[PDB]
Design a protein around this ligand. Structure first.
Ligand SMILES: NC(=[NH2+])NCCC[C@H](N)C(=O)O
Ligand SMILES: NC(=[NH2+])NCCC[C@H](N)C(=O)O
Ligand SMILES: [Fe+2]
Ligand SMILES: [Fe+2]
Lengths: 337, 337
């Protein structure tokens, strides 16, 4: 497969769950300063074979994601899928939120955005009634188009963690790498040049955060990024294994640049053609390499009966200090005037 | 102090030493692929209080270095200081080399250069007879001028680890941060612009590596960087806490750019004025933040009697994949044609 996969034994899965439950019993919340600081060290107590996989798989040159299968989730204990992310920090999902953060701590520094889901570090992906055909992760009936997470920002995550709390109908996450087998060298050259506009996605809009959140200054920076985007490259680094920065619905060529436009149009077609599926079943966790791959989610018919698909999500950077300009006044929650 | 300091208790120091000895007994060498992959996970077995310090101190906004005091070193067991780095992998220094790598594994991904000390990851700092007045770390009588480690390279370390095997006369390492209390905004503006040349230092020259090393292709990239340096900025990131990229002996203004020259001249004067001393006594380890601080070493009279000052050194990056263009054919040893 194009991702690296690990399956917990029942004993390993139970041990990780017990550790997460212990943390949930000793800390007030996942996003509190105390657990944010302690989690990477507590994560050292996770099963050795899992720690070995995470340390090595992160250093491999090829995988689009690190996938860990086999975390038990009891639907009765978990309770119904929340109707909105606002009310999604349910007691039943609490230990799994701690588990996600522990796993994330093995890969890097977790963080959130001042302008997304009220500045939470652990966020929620679930269908919101009335928001089926939006461009945000709470969509359903409309496919979530492929994207680099927070592509607009130089402080975007290196890894995006997704823990499936439930996914009864097996809705697929989509993934694609750089279509290096099909990009001609001229097109590749153009994609490496600063000739593209990438605007913030709709999750950073005031309407998709709680009221009175909301007037906070960090939405100014989002407005600037949308109104006056600076030209940037889509590809960076090594020509034989480039890093990728693009969003199918929020990228554009630089104004009047038809060669750049042609390169982007070609890239869209090649990514559409090479897009593949990863189904995160209940208890599966994926850490998507946000530099090597774009990701999305297939269209699905939401249930709205209390058993809708539901993920916990977390943004991870290899170096928090890279984003210090955007340390709102925290750190761990990013944004700018 | 401007650095963050931790002192091992005798029990903690002994436990860390036992772990390093265990590793030395089970692995053939520190730089072998096996220990490079395993060290970050084995490091999870280090004393908890040390792991907590390393996880937290790395995330603080202020320190120029992380300093760990109190590792025992027995001079009788260590043996005489080597006459050259080539012959410096002595049985007596072996466990301490493993210890350094374990500590480094808590902070990030270790790596070396194809063009420095024969591509070794764990390197040596000791005085070489005849090389007293050189610009390299084996100098003595001539002060080692302040510098960002490998300032010429975009793949330079985030942290530089220095473990003092011996330092009988207490020779000081020098450190300085960005002189933010004295840089006027115009000068600061200019330092943030791509108007400076930074060439590779003399440690990357063929003459300072073993013969037949030496014709290898990576020296071509070093020649290109020296002959045709691309203009780069000295300061990056947040204006209120910038990252620093400069070398007192290998930096220059862009050709004919007198405003840039004035800014560099001013910076030299301010760094010279704010330079301070850190003495790494026997058994002390420092991890210098290579983005926040420049460092050097005071002039000293070498002994050449077998008890000269001697450090083990290691380069650390928060993300190895940042340098994939320069993965010679390894990774862990960097360089380019
Ligand atoms: N092409 C897109 N739909 N981009 C936006 C992706 C979803 C966005 N990151 C969110 O959490 O809502
Ligand atoms: N200004 C300088 N002397 N720069 C070079 C610093 C020493 C070099 N990094 C070495 O290990 O030899
Ligand atoms: Fe996403
Ligand atoms: Fe140095």
């Amino acid at each position: 497969r194009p991702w690296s996969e690990f399956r917990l034994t029942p004993a390993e899965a139970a041990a990780a769950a017990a550790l997460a439950a212990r943390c949930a019993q000793r800390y007030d919340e996942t996003d509190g300063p105390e657990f944010l600081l302690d989690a990477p060290v507590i994560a050292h107590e996770l099963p050795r074979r899992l720690r070995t996989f995470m340390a090595r798989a992160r250093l491999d040159a090829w995988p689009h994601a690190l996938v860990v299968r086999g975390n038990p989730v009891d639907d009765a204990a978990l309770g119904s899928t929340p109707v909105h992310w606002r009310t999604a920090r349910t007691p039943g999902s609490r230990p799994l939120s701690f588990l996600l953060m522990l796993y994330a701590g093995l890969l890097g520094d977790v963080f959130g955005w001042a302008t997304q889901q009220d500045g939470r570090v652990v966020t929620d992906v679930l269908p919101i009634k009335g928001g089926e055909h939006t461009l945000v992760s709470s969509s359903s009936r409309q496919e979530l188009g492929w994207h680099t997470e927070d592509a607009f920002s130089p402080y975007r995550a290196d890894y995006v963690g997704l823990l499936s709390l439930r996914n009864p109908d097996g809705v697929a996450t989509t993934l694609a790498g750089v279509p290096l087998d099909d990009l001609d060298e001229r097109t590749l050259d153009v994609l490496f040049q600063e000739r593209f506009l990438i605007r913030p996605d709709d999750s950073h809009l005031q309407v998709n955060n709680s009221t009175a959140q909301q007037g906070r200054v960090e939405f100014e920076g989002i407005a600037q990024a949308a109104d006056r985007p600076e030209p940037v490259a889509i590809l960076t680094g090594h020509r034989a294994a480039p890093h990728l920065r693009v969003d199918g619905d929020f990228s554009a060529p630089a104004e009047g640049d038809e060669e750049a436009a042609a390169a982007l149009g070609t890239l869209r077609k090649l990514i559409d053609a090479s897009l593949y599926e990863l189904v995160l079943d209940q208890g599966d966790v994926a850490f998507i390499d946000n530099r090597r791959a774009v990701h999305g989610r297939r269209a699905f018919q939401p249930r709205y009966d209390g058993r809708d698909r539901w993920l916990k999500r977390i943004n991870i950077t290899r170096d928090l200090h890279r984003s210090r300009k955007a340390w709102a006044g925290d750190s761990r929650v990013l944004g700018q005037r």
